[PDB]
Amino acid sequence: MRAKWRKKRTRRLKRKRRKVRARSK
Amino acid sequence: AVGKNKRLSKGKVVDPFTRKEWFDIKAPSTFENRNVGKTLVNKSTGLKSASDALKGRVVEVCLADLQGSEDHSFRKIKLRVDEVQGKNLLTNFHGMDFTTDKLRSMVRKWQTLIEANVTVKTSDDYVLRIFAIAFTRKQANQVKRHSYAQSSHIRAIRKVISEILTKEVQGSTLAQLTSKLIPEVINKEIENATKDIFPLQNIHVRKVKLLKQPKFDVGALMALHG
Amino acid sequence: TPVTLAKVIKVLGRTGSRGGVTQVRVEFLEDTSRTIVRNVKGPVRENDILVLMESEREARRLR
Amino acid sequence: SQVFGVARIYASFNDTFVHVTDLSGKETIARVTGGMKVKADRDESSPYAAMLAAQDVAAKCKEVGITAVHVKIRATGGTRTKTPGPGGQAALRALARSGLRIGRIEDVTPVPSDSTRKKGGRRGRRL
Amino acid sequence: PKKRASNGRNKKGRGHVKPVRCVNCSKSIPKDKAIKRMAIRNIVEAAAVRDLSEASVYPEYALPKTYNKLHYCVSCAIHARIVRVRSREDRKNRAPP
RNA sequence: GGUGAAAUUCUUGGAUUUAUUGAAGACUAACUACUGCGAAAGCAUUUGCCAAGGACGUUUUCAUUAAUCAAGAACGAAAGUUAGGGGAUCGAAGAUGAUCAGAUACCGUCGUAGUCUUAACCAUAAACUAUGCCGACUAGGGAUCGGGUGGUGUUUUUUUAAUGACCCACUCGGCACCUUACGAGAAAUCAAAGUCUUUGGGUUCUGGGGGGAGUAUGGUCGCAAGGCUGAAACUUAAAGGAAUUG
RNA sequence: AAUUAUUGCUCUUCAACGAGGAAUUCCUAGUAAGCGCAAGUCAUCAGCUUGCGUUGAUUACGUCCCUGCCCUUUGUACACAC
RNA sequence: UCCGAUAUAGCGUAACGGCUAUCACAUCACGCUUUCACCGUGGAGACCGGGGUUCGACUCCCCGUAUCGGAGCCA
């Protein structure tokens, strides 16, 4: 529900897509 | 709560009041009633020297008790034991204080509180911190309800009060200054100077505290107790 | 044994959490013109005389 | 004509302290708390427990030589509630009956000039 | 929708109020939004003045009182049989009872 | 000691408590307000120094030098980051005692980072009055803050004066408040959210049903955390606002 | 038709119960309480019920303290309505 | 080998030689809540073992049992 934790959840996934992508470039 | 202690000794009877002796506190000469109270201490044993443990006690007593009359009812006075001999141990001035309920009565809203302190020393090498408190008052025939001060009267009032306290201490060593607070004469002087700035009711000055002392001067103390 | 006979002039009303205490403005029989309020347990009418072991306990008033 | 002590009644919540000392305050007489007279671990601050504790202080005063007392009522103070506990009044109430003479009742609750911080967090104590 | 014109508080022209702590739960609350109530009772109590005065040296000297100012948060104030709730019309009333 | 009740915990090695001191760091109570200052964030102990600011008074001076603003720039709560100092309280994390069917939550006791400071980043907030700035006009009323004007007014100096504080009247500027609706609005409400179909005073920014989505990608800034800019595919007939009765 | 005695009568047998703990029911005047009678169900069987009469107190003449319910205010993202 | 310490309901725990021994938890029942939790009311459960002292031992002395700590070793 809470938009505070969907912002937090997305930010933690921003880290993952940014860290898994560094393995290529 | 009674049967709750689990362990009383980390490792694993004689009544003490029969071993104690009673004295009587003597107030300085600048007080109406020399009789103050009564204390306790063990006998002067071969190692403890119970006269020594009784040397530095500090007792606080109301000024109404010392002066008899109940006008000076709040006015807490602290007396410090300086010399003991012949079971009439002698005490000297140690500081004056206000009762909490008196201080809280004066502080009411819709009026300005003014405070002022100085660190002026006396002629007998005593060092004190005089505190002064005052409250703005609503002049007669006033309509508005608060009557605050304009934050420049306060600076002028605080400058006037600080100047008065320093001058009124230099020259008064211990005795006349103690006999200056008892008859409430300093505050009457404060009102006279500040009556041209702002009304300022309730100029009961404040508590006073000692900071440091010179050499004992045993003869000076004996000059008070006759 | 100080015993005071006091005669009531007014029944203020019931009081207490469970409504078992009555408030009464009661005058003293002797030394008239000095009165007191006293909690009363049982039923009382106007101009009834009471017995006291304390004369000047002022019961609290709900006002 | 009177031997005067200082009551120094400290009645916080969860307990109540009453212990009379000498005028100088360095020699104490018969310190008994509210948790010494009842075994509940919950009625330590109760008015009944303080009533029993006050009588013991007053009783032991007679055999020592204290016939009058100066009352100094105290709350926890500091950053805590600063209000007297439930047993503060009963302790003062009870010792008057034993025969001690009262004088110069005064509140000695320590009050700060906006001191450090109060425990509980920003959102208080959630209940 | 807006429920109050002041909306909780007395902040018009400050922007910040330097909050104080509640007395029951110790919750942060701005000073203006606080619900300050003053409690000034006698030290002993209203009905106990005999037993202290009956056994009192310095007869009827002052019988002094205790002064302290209490701050509650809105949650603690409502729960404590205080300003609890008023109807929509009576919410506008500001005068004390 | 703590709690609704407890327990973890400290205690005959003297805990809690009382008294006399000493140290450290933080904070600035009560006074404290429908009160003040600041562009906002914000700012509450005394004093000294430095520079700054509004309003008022003005028969002083200049003379249209102005309003709003892409780009660009200064400041920017808390949290967070880098490096020293400090590190008392409280205390994300963590450890424990409970409660619970479970409780890595609420509650209790500890407790690092942090909380304070110096130098440097960050550039965010329900950063809200959810109400851009400037200008003019439209109903009354009292209160208050600052400045000014007048009154043989009151009080105190040396009865007396100039003063200081008050009282009355007026005026400028300000934080606000009360009543009403010619007026507005969907209403709640609003002296502006009024002078808008009888539609045009000047100007900047932003929105175009709801999700996907402030997401993906590309730039740019940042030590990092992240900030700014910012879709499409796809999916849907409702989401949403204010009030009424239950 | 009575055997797990339908009930009535006689004799003998003569058990807990020494006034009842935490709780909880009913009750304001002929009311409570004591006592019995008629009817109901019945071929037989009242320790039940519906009514009736005899004797017949104390304590209130109030309160919202506990419990239950009603009204108002209040919040709502419920309307098949917690 | 010596010295010292420990040994009570299903768990923990304290003992005055004038009592086959209190408690909180676990349960037996009855309670109070729409219901589930908290809370209340009366029991059953116990002294490591064996001897001696004693008008009267859980409790005072001796031995053994199991555990723990510290000390020393010419068959």
mmCIF file of N, CA, C and O (backbone and C1' of nucleotides) in Angstrom, chain C residues 14 16-19 42-43, chain G residues 59-65:
data_model
loop_
_atom_site.group_PDB
_atom_site.id
_atom_site.type_symbol
_atom_site.label_atom_id
_atom_site.label_comp_id
_atom_site.label_asym_id
_atom_site.label_seq_id
_atom_site.Cartn_x
_atom_site.Cartn_y
_atom_site.Cartn_z
ATOM 1 N N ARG C 14 -28.552 14.753 46.776
ATOM 2 C CA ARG C 14 -27.767 13.533 46.845
ATOM 3 C C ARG C 14 -26.408 13.735 46.188
ATOM 4 O O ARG C 14 -26.232 14.602 45.328
ATOM 5 N N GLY C 16 -22.230 11.431 45.808
ATOM 6 C CA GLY C 16 -21.546 10.157 45.853
ATOM 7 C C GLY C 16 -21.649 9.401 44.540
ATOM 8 O O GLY C 16 -22.529 9.637 43.714
ATOM 9 N N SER C 17 -20.713 8.467 44.354
ATOM 10 C CA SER C 17 -20.677 7.697 43.114
ATOM 11 C C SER C 17 -21.941 6.867 42.942
ATOM 12 O O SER C 17 -22.511 6.806 41.847
ATOM 13 N N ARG C 18 -22.399 6.229 44.015
ATOM 14 C CA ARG C 18 -23.580 5.380 43.983
ATOM 15 C C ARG C 18 -24.814 6.066 44.552
ATOM 16 O O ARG C 18 -25.834 5.406 44.765
ATOM 17 N N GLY C 19 -24.745 7.371 44.795
ATOM 18 C CA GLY C 19 -25.897 8.123 45.263
ATOM 19 C C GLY C 19 -26.406 7.731 46.633
ATOM 20 O O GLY C 19 -27.620 7.575 46.816
ATOM 21 N N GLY C 42 -28.204 8.163 55.946
ATOM 22 C CA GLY C 42 -29.577 7.751 55.778
ATOM 23 C C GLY C 42 -30.503 8.865 55.337
ATOM 24 O O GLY C 42 -30.068 9.940 54.913
ATOM 25 N N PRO C 43 -31.811 8.620 55.425
ATOM 26 C CA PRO C 43 -32.792 9.630 55.004
ATOM 27 C C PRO C 43 -32.928 10.735 56.043
ATOM 28 O O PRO C 43 -32.960 10.473 57.247
ATOM 29 P P U G 59 -36.774 -0.132 58.279
ATOM 30 O "O5'" U G 59 -35.716 0.270 57.159
ATOM 31 C "C5'" U G 59 -34.367 -0.168 57.232
ATOM 32 C "C4'" U G 59 -33.817 -0.456 55.858
ATOM 33 C "C3'" U G 59 -34.070 0.618 54.816
ATOM 34 O "O3'" U G 59 -33.125 1.669 54.872
ATOM 35 C "C1'" U G 59 -34.669 -1.486 53.932
ATOM 36 P P A G 60 -33.617 3.182 55.075
ATOM 37 O "O5'" A G 60 -33.659 3.777 53.601
ATOM 38 C "C5'" A G 60 -34.622 3.322 52.664
ATOM 39 C "C4'" A G 60 -34.151 3.518 51.248
ATOM 40 C "C3'" A G 60 -34.663 4.763 50.545
ATOM 41 O "O3'" A G 60 -33.937 5.929 50.884
ATOM 42 C "C1'" A G 60 -34.873 2.897 49.114
ATOM 43 P P C G 61 -34.704 7.324 51.082
ATOM 44 O "O5'" C G 61 -35.652 7.431 49.809
ATOM 45 C "C5'" C G 61 -35.117 7.744 48.529
ATOM 46 C "C4'" C G 61 -36.176 7.728 47.457
ATOM 47 C "C3'" C G 61 -37.156 8.897 47.499
ATOM 48 O "O3'" C G 61 -37.507 9.272 46.172
ATOM 49 C "C1'" C G 61 -38.341 6.860 47.710
ATOM 50 P P G G 62 -36.777 10.522 45.478
ATOM 51 O "O5'" G G 62 -35.225 10.230 45.692
ATOM 52 C "C5'" G G 62 -34.281 10.593 44.697
ATOM 53 C "C4'" G G 62 -32.919 10.007 44.968
ATOM 54 C "C3'" G G 62 -32.030 9.839 43.749
ATOM 55 O "O3'" G G 62 -31.373 11.042 43.400
ATOM 56 C "C1'" G G 62 -31.960 7.875 45.080
ATOM 57 P P U G 63 -31.060 11.372 41.864
ATOM 58 O "O5'" U G 63 -29.766 10.501 41.553
ATOM 59 C "C5'" U G 63 -28.569 10.680 42.294
ATOM 60 C "C4'" U G 63 -27.537 9.660 41.897
ATOM 61 C "C3'" U G 63 -27.333 9.494 40.401
ATOM 62 O "O3'" U G 63 -26.429 10.453 39.882
ATOM 63 C "C1'" U G 63 -27.591 7.368 41.412
ATOM 64 P P C G 64 -26.489 10.890 38.339
ATOM 65 O "O5'" C G 64 -25.569 9.816 37.608
ATOM 66 C "C5'" C G 64 -24.274 9.512 38.113
ATOM 67 C "C4'" C G 64 -23.825 8.125 37.723
ATOM 68 C "C3'" C G 64 -23.374 7.970 36.273
ATOM 69 O "O3'" C G 64 -22.320 7.015 36.209
ATOM 70 C "C1'" C G 64 -25.163 6.496 36.702
ATOM 71 P P C G 65 -20.832 7.402 36.681
ATOM 72 O "O5'" C G 65 -20.568 6.437 37.918
ATOM 73 C "C5'" C G 65 -19.255 6.229 38.411
ATOM 74 C "C4'" C G 65 -19.121 4.885 39.079
ATOM 75 C "C3'" C G 65 -19.452 3.674 38.223
ATOM 76 O "O3'" C G 65 -18.384 3.302 37.369
ATOM 77 C "C1'" C G 65 -20.467 3.452 40.349
#
